Write a protein that binds this ligand. Structure first.
Ligand SMILES: *[C@]1(O)CO[C@H]2[C@@H]1N(C(=O)[C@H](CC(C)C)NC(=O)c1ccc(-c3csc(N4CCN(C)CC4)n3)cc1)C[C@@H]2F
Ligand code: NA
Length: 216
């Protein structure tokens, strides 16, 4: 059995909260967050990886028009690397691919998709692998104005995924099981950039429907 609670913020696996701006690069932030966790586990060092590298260079995605995290991990593998944020900084608009192997800060040997809808498998992956890339329905006004507590809205649509975020842990708050979710809308959004989302509540907001992690 996995631990009852896991919080990778407490383990030094999670970089500061970023702000993607208007660019539809949620997928790229979700992807780099999962890579950053694996890089810390493998090398002992926490550093910011480049979402702009992904935006500009993953041709299977649509840059600031959106993308998938699976395609991002596939690119890092096929490309034999991803650059650091410092080497390839975020500008929030699409530009020509500027990937440089001199700035390479991580590699990827593959990825794994979590079995669809399986929150227990997602829990075990978070516990035993690290932070996991996830997609959710973030379209409700109640999500937009999240402040505190465990987020649950009966109107959330588990069949309508429209945002990519990072599951950095899980636990329980006053009896309500949750996922600890890192967003990419700045520290001013939510609770210092984070939201606790209902866990084991009928796959609320589709949290386990499009989850994946990279391998290093
Ligand atoms: C996030 O910033 C949240 O708001 C934005 C952005 N979104 C996404 O990235 C979502 C995330 C999923 C639900 C995990 N993804 C998409 O909406 C998405 C995925 C793929 C594509 C795609 C790939 S190739 C391609 N095109 C279209 C255009 N033609 C000319 C070339 C190929 N499109 C697009 C969008 C959701 C929201 F967009
Ligand atoms: Na692909």
């Amino acid at each position: 059995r996995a631990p009852d609670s896991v919080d990778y913020r407490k383990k030094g696996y999670v970089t500061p909260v970023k702000n993607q701006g208007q660019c539809g690069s949620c997928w790229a932030f979700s992807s780099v967050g999962a890579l950053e966790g694996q890089l810390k586990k493998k090398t002992g060092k926490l550093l910011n990886l480049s979402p702009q590298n992904l935006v500009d260079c993953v041709s299977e995605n649509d840059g600031c028009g959106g993308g998938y995290m699976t395609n991002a991990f596939q690119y890092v593998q096929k490309n034999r690397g991803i650059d650091s944020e410092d080497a390839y900084p975020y500008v929030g608009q699409e530009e020509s691919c500027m990937y440089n192997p001199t700035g390479k800060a991580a590699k990827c040997r593959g990825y794994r998709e979590i079995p669809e809808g399986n929150e227990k498998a997602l829990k075990r992956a978070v516990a035993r692998v690290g932070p996991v890339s996830v997609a959710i329905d973030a379209s409700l006004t109640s999500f937009q104005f999240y402040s505190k507590g465990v987020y649950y809205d009966e109107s959330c649509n588990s069949d309508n995924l429209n945002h990519a975020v990072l599951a950095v842990g899980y636990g329980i708050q006053k009896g309500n099981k949750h996922w600890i979710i890192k967003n990419s809308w700045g520290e001013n959004w939510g609770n210092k950039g984070y939201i606790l989302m209902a866990r084991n509540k009928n796959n609320a907001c589709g949290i386990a429907n499009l989850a994946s992690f990279p391998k290093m």
